[PDB]
Paper text:
Cytosolic ALDH1A enzymes, and specifically the [name] isoform, are good markers of cancer stem cells and have been implicated in carcinogenesis, chemoresistance and relapse. As previously observed in other members of the enzyme superfamily, each [name] subunit is composed of three structural domains: a catalytic domain, a cofactor-binding domain and an oligomerization domain.
A PEG molecule can also be seen within the substrate-binding pocket in both subunits of the crystal [name] [name] structure. The cofactor-binding domain contains a non-canonical Rossmann-fold motif, slightly different from that found in other NAD(P)+-dependent enzymes. The three crystal structures described in this work do not present remarkable conformational changes among them and share the same disordered areas. The volume of the pocket in the cofactor-binding domain is 444, 439 and 411 Å3 for the [name] form, the [name]-NAD+ and the [name]-ATP complexes, whereas the volumes of the substrate-binding pockets are 231, 220 and 208 Å3 for the same forms, respectively.
Numbering used by the authors:
A (entry chain A), B (entry chain B), C (entry chain A), D (entry chain B): 20 to 508
Write the structure that this text describes.
């Protein structure tokens, strides 16, 4: 375990364009606060449309034919991405501390989970750079026909506050491996790790203008990126409602391509033949990981009647033993919620569950009347039409529902507008495969939870998103297909 | 050569749902009129929102787990598509005669071009049904990870008036081969071939609800398909303006996936070392084919200064010998235009050319007041800022521009918001390949024009579209990726 | 069920070259006998090296550049293969009767299994013809690099006596879909279905010389094909010992590519948590199908101790109820063995099992002292070092062995030089996947047996073969990779 | 430019097994001598059958299930290969000096050509380790079918004397990236770089037994690897005659898979429209690079009659200015030949040219009696039936043949039993593509020669080899396909 850097001085708080640090055009700044100490960390430069316009023009010049970045051979782009992963591993403790200060997640979780995900994602996509291949297509005796997988051009990345550096790297790694240029917008709540990564990008040797970063707000920077007529592609992670606004702005303007990684109403199904202890620990971590602030969070834990009561009992014991406190402390498993708006919203849904009919098995209130901490809550006797079972909580609350048959639980799990992830716990080959096939979800985990790999694609069915991130499938979002058809005389 | 059908009577004019013919729920009907004889062929049922709701419900029931369509093995869906291709070959003359009566295009063009493409596309995708493969991904020693390429669900298709049946087949062939269900809306101007196809779909053996057809108007039937909360995917062929409305409505409702095939400002590049007779004849067919009413139409012909005057001279001669007239008449190379609007805008573009400084070389006015036909027009001394070189003409007007260097023509060719097709004419290996890689177009033809194959993908860069039709790439538009991760004890 | 054609007159008994029927150069003929009636069916022309030489020269001329077959577009080759599958389906009853007369397999098994396999294999590979694609490879800014998947050229096919038409089609379908020419040698024991297929090949429209067939013996025709300096590839199905001779002759001569589908010592593992009735019926059909004359035949049935005794009892009941008789009779499940050499060899191994220590549970002798029929035999108490558990029987004998643990049964199943197929029967997800991974076998079936698909590759690990048949993997055996690298100046 | 090492002492001369250095079991040793100074560098341990048996056993234990190598995750094998590439870059000067002392090739050629290829190949295949994906195949509603691309097992590698370390890396990089274990045998003439690599393999962290190195002779160590019953795959680079012995021995023992990279009779085709200075300089490097001792050497230079005399004139001038001499000397373009045999056969081929009717234009004899060097020779008026145009020279002799038509030169170029590489020089798009598709060669270079990439496959058609090295195609040689079919109840 590394030593927690309790007091770190922030060095990077400016707009990053053409490998230079700039003040905002207006002079405006915004504060970034620590959700644990409830104190301001620093002020970051606040961008607007004029700053986005300078960042898009920087990215266009870097992408123009004959530019140093365009004439670089495929293996050199991979080398640059490996050089960046080395720099991320060198400054791993500085980066994880910035993530903890901005988000409130435990320092050890950001070090061993978020930063490991970033390094792995960068190394996997560095290896694809010289392996992006098109096809040679058989047609007629006198025709030569082939496809090229060309870069799209300028890519915009809009990232969320829960996993700020990870969600940025998920977009940056395949975009740069494909030979594109970028304009990044970190979340208004969490800009520090993105700005740190900027210095490492300059240090790794990327030509100026290949990566540009403009901190600021959704209605200003976000809207300017979504509607820009010179951005060819946008990747967005966040809520379904904001995702819809991004896609509409993209259509209305220049029909730029749009990847969306949105929310879900994720089911977690526990069969009567499951290894109950495994199912209890996995459903527990699936709900409470990152203070329940995960897109993959189990929002509906369906448990077969034969094991329901024991499942509830063993889950309650886990929830009471979960250490909540200072994220810079080695024993901490749960930090504070991101902000007052999220904290009050979780408590509003917890109160709703009480007056709807659920059985509060433990938790149900704040830890102390001073911080943003919520005690791990477990609700039993939860039904399909209750608010705690219908709405995305984004907090530490485990709603446990009951089911009798597989055909029934399939219908109940698929009755949502969402389809991000699903998890199934059973020892029976036929049940597991029937459920893997019939669940309308982008990822189905069997006898595990949150099992993510740089090489396995991730994304949603229905209103949980469009397109995929990770794996070879992420390259299709960052390339344009060109068919060359030559007729011989 | 086949004989055209004299008094072919239309038999299918109703709404097609669950393999049955229905009258519109409002009782309303609309007229389909022969553009050549200017007389009404018949009255087709006019659908609206409640007919679309009835078709989507029928498609959802056909897509349910355990339905005859879903439980069919992969090779049987291919067998059905081969059975449909056989019926389209048997009734080839009936379908081509319906297409001539609706669009006014020459009978031999619809028989040997449109119907040939329909048959080749159906046969090509019939072969993909048992070859849609996902991946097995290596991760860790104790994990089994894989992807499934599942059907998306209910697909809506919205097609244009210029190639009614072919544009319909381009969407229907990969959708059915991937195991989806469909709700089709033919253009209001040309609904007869789509309705005839419905009878063939029933005869071929497709289960009820797999293909549903709802004739009607854009603001009514089209809008209802775009906004439908139970349609998972939509494919649209038409204009950039209508494509933007379709994509905006899709994002506003349920984030359904959208493929778009739109227009372009397609350049032709003729180098000094081209086979000048090949380039003249290909650029001629590129500008004047189907009365210039084709998404692949060349709207800018760039010619190197060394061959400029001779290219203009031979193009003027070639355009004068072109036979325009009666569609059913064997000798006809160009039937009539589609409508009054755009006909006026073409003559207004022609007048704009004369006033902006271009040299009218031939044509430049209407033919003979008993049908909307334009005389093949050729403009020389054309420059980039002129209207005839900036707007999408959609008529028989050939603007010939001059260029000196390859670097200059690449920049002028790509100075557009569009990028559907491009054509290069040169006998030089390095020039051909430098232009193929530098042109920002979905398709680059070398020493040919309109060379399309069911096996080569087709689609636009920038504002010319999203996604691809044809080839193995069409399958990505009709499938959803599911990752299944299994952790072993 | 079709009507069994009890008395059929054979029409095709000659050498097929350039779509013409020829007598052998020497004048020699060989007899083909019915293993049921023990009477001669007819005399077939007997080829030698001079006949093979004329067949290879016919195949070379058909393959030369500019030949009708080489200039045919990809989709036309697929069309030809579909035309052949239609002709095979038309003459399905004639073909299945010829297979029964030559092999002794039940007419219903040849109609519904062998002939269905042929038709399916032909239709699947007809669909690959226009989908054989190479790659476009990213290298340097100034280099264009791509691969072509070219046909190999003249292909030799040497087929066995157990599934004569099926094993021929497994080789012919991908070879012709890839654009190759062929020289076929059916087994000396079973030439009639191959010669029938020749007439259908001429009838389907294949140019002369694309498929050539030379009946005869292994040391004459087989050796001439293996060593021919103008044959580029050979595919062989048969014994490991003859497979080794084929591969050596291929190396010694011109280094032609060689696919080998050889024998196996196939394990069939039955766990204590298996659905015992399913495991009993699958192991039964796996052993006794085609009179035990299958390359996929279970030679070692390992059963966990908890269910051993019941497994033995239920298996014995199946073996006693199995109908043995005239293959042209609707109730027959088991015909005669192929010949006297095979029949005496099976009885020699059955006697060996008696004097080695096995418990003869049923069967053990011929049905009548007049025919080639052997009564279904089941041996219990079989151990690893017994002859009935070590050697390939190729007859109706079920050796049932016992195991205690999974780690033990993995070591015992993998202790062979072979690795064709394996089958596992369990309801536990982890056991099934651990066994699928750790068994060194080309195909692992879980809760099924003999589940073959045109789209799933088949072949052996270790001494069970080289290369694969079926699926997309079969195309790699029938194409040569060419890299084209172009440097731009 | 780097400085050559003056008195570099060799440190690694023993047998490498289980990450340890061993003396040969017989105690025997053999001498490695510098071909330039003609003095003994050192005495390397001489292995035989019992040392090969000890290396195969160590490789089998490293390949067992549960071994540290097998249980490593896919990304960690790539990490190890990147670690090895870093050590090869660090010790680049030591490795290139060892290669110069063993082969006599110029120090700057081994530093910037051989060592560069080794580093690029290792880095390329390090990126494939987590991207080797099998397929999920669609079959029936109730079946789950998939393929796994598993490692083959123990791989033997047998390399030549001309590019010792590079040919070793071409086999080692994909074998280790696929998870195999290896037994290597460097050429008897050049074993020092292979032994040095072994120390780097231990330093990099590869578990013991993963790579084992056994120096020795062909008839002893090579024969034992070819016939070993526990080696699953062998890769061989060398002559067609030795390759046939290796493949015959492999088939005779256990049917181990064999990749072969052999010689060729590589043509150069120069069209009348070529850039004549480019073609002269490329055909010169193609004939005289590495003293003509390269598998890619041009052995037939076909020139169109229109440029024939001028091509011969400029080639004669170019060959006269070529600097031959001391390898460590910066100015040297061509060091000495390898051995006494072949040196005599080259002068005998040269004399055969004069007597058969060819015109000796320059060179044609030895240089200066104190080393085996030949003066760059050029023959004009060469015809197909002549010895200088039929035999593989393997020396600095340029035979220039004349041609009139493209159809004629295609036939003359392909009238060989070989087909490794071909090179075409033309500025014409149609000629370049017609020749690329009609030449029967594994690689067709256009307007370049020796343009190799770790990402483009390389190998021969006909008797030039079996299988491919480099690119994604190399992975098929180092994996075995397993189909897993699961039928659901």
């Amino acid at each position: 375990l590394p030593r927690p850097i309790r007091n770190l001085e922030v060095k990077f708080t400016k707009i990053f364009i053409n490998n230079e640090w700039h003040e905002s055009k207006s002079g405006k700044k915004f504060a970034t606060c620590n959700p644990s100490t409830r104190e301001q960390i620093c002020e970051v430069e606040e961008g607007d449309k004029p700053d986005v316009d300078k960042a898009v023009e920087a990215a266009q010049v870097a992408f123009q034919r004959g530019s140093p970045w365009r004439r670089l051979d495929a293996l050199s782009r991979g080398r640059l991405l490996h050089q960046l992963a080395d720099l991320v591993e060198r400054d791993r403790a500085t980066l994880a501390a910035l993530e903890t200060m901005d988000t409130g997640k435990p320092f050890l979780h950001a070090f061993f989970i978020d930063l490991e995900g970033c390094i792995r994602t960068l190394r996997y996509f560095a290896g694809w750079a010289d392996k992006i291949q098109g096809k040679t297509i058989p047609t007629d005796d006198n025709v030569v026909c082939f496809t090229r997988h060309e870069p799209i051009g300028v890519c915009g990345a809009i990232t969320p506050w829960n996993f700020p550096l990870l969600m940025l790297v998920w977009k940056l790694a395949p975009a740069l491996c494909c030979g594109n240029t970028m304009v990044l917008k970190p979340a208004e709540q969490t800009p520090l790790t993105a700005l740190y990564l900027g210095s490492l990008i300059k240090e790794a040797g990327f030509p100026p203008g290949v990566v540009n970063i403009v901190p600021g707000f959704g209605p200003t920077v976000g809207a300017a990126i979504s509607s820009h007529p010179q951005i060819n592609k946008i990747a967005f992670t966040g809520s379904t409602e904001v995702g819809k606004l991004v896609k509409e702005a993209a259509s209305r303007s220049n029909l730029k391509r749009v990847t969306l990684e949105l929310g879900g109403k994720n089911p977690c199904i526990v069969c009567a033949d499951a290894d109950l202890d495994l199912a209890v620990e996995c459903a527990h971590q699936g709900v409470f990981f990152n203070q329940g602030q995960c897109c993959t969070a189990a929002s509906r834990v369906f448990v077969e009647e034969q094991v329901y009561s024991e499942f509830v009992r063993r889950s309650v014991e886990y929830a009471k033993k979960r250490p909540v406190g200072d994220p810079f402390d080695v024993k901490t498993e749960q930090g504070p919620q991101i902000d007052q708006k999220q904290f009050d919203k979780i408590l509003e849904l917890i109160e709703s569950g009480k007056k709807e009919g659920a059985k509060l098995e433990c938790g149900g209130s704040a830890m102390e009347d001073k911080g943003l901490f919520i005690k791990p809550t477990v609700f039993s006797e939860v039904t399909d039409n209750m608010r705690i079972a219908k709405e995305e909580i984004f907090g530490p609350v485990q709603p446990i529902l009951k089911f009798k048959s597989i055909e029934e639980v399939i219908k109940r799990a698929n009755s949502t507008d969402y389809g991000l992830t699903a998890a199934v716990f059973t020892k029976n080959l036929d049940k597991a495969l029937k459920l893997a096939s019939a669940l309308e979800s982008g990822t189905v985990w069997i006898n595990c939870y949150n099992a993510l790999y740089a090489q396995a694609p991730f994304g949603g069915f229905k209103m949980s998103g469009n397109g995929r991130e990770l794996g070879e499938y992420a390259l299709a979002e960052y390339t344009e297909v060109k068919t060359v058809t030559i007729k011989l005389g």
